[PDB]
Each structure stands twice: as C-alpha cells, then as structure tokens.
Design a protein around this ligand. Structure first.
Ligand SMILES: COc1ccccc1CC(=O)N1CCN[C@H](C(N)=O)C1
Ligand SMILES: [Zn+2]
Length: 140
C-alpha cells in the first residue's frame, strides 16, 4: 500500500483505490495503473520534473529503502494477476529489486522529488508507474 500526497491530490495504484477515492475522483488510467483523488488537507510530497534513471524506492516487505537504476518509462507486458489480465502497461519503469504484491504504492524518488510508485514486480524485478509527465499535479 502507499500514496503520493501532493497539493490537494492523493495518487494511488488504481487497483488499490478505495471507495472514498472513487467518490472523490480526479483522474484514472487503467493502462498506467494510476488513480488520483482529491484531498481536504494539503500534502508535502513534491513531484520530480527530470530525466533521472537512478533513485531510491521504499520496499514494505523489507521495511527498507533501496537505491536502484531504472529504465525509462515504456510500454511493458505485465503477466495476469488477480487485479488485471495479462496486458501491456504504459509509462512503466523496471529495476532489479525485491518486491511482493503488497509493496505496490511504495515511493520511488530521486534528488528532484517523487518519480513514481511501485506497480509491478516478480523474481527480483520491481516496476514503477511514472508520474513525472503529469504536470497538472503541481497546480490547483
Ligand atoms: C509489486 O508487485 C509484485 C511483486 C512481486 C510479484 C508480483 C507482484 C504483483 C504484480 O506485479 N502485479 C499485481 C497487481 N497489479 C500489477 C499491475 N500493475 O498490473 C501487477
Ligand atoms: Zn530527478
């Protein structure tokens, strides 16, 4: 689990969105595994606006933050799960790192701010849904 709290937005994995998220919906995209809802309180995270390919992510199944090198956002085939059929997910970045299904939502960050959240993994890989292109997260 986990979310990004930037301005009056809450960014979560679409597959982990709550009823309150759907009832306060701003934007969702199943091909990216992302959903954004509105919040009453202002958040403290800032979004990275950069070209970094190195950063650090939070892994809940280890209670640890790990440094990683990750690929540029791309269209990648993701195997069938209990949340989606086997399909292509867009804006996904891969790295070598430990992950388990409940690690989704952990933040990936670089020196400029939040880059994305854990969205996929398996066999020593971890995938992150990029948010750096969502410029509207920085405005009301
Ligand atoms: C961190 O996720 C894992 C890690 C290790 C093994 C398996 C996973 C789960 C994973 O890859 N899923 C299931 C949830 N939906 C994802 C999606 N974005 O389509 C894909
Ligand atoms: Zn950066």
């Amino acid at each position: 689990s986990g979310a990004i709290y930037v301005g009056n937005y809450r960014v979560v994995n679409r597959h982990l969105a709550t009823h309150n998220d759907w009832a306060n919906l701003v934007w969702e995209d199943s091909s990216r595994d992302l959903l954004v809802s509105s919040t009453t309180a202002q958040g403290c995270d800032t979004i990275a606006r950069c070209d970094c390919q190195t950063g650090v992510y939070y892994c809940s199944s280890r209670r640890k933050h790990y440094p990683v090198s990750f690929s540029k956002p791309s269209l990648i085939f993701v195997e069938a799960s209990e949340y989606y059929p086997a399909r292509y997910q867009s804006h996904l970045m891969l790295a070598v790192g430990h992950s388990e299904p409940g690690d989704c939502g952990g933040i990936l960050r670089c020196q400029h701010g939040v880059v994305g959240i854990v969205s996929t993994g398996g066999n020593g890989l971890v995938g992150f849904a990029d948010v750096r292109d969502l410029l509207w997260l920085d405005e009301e």
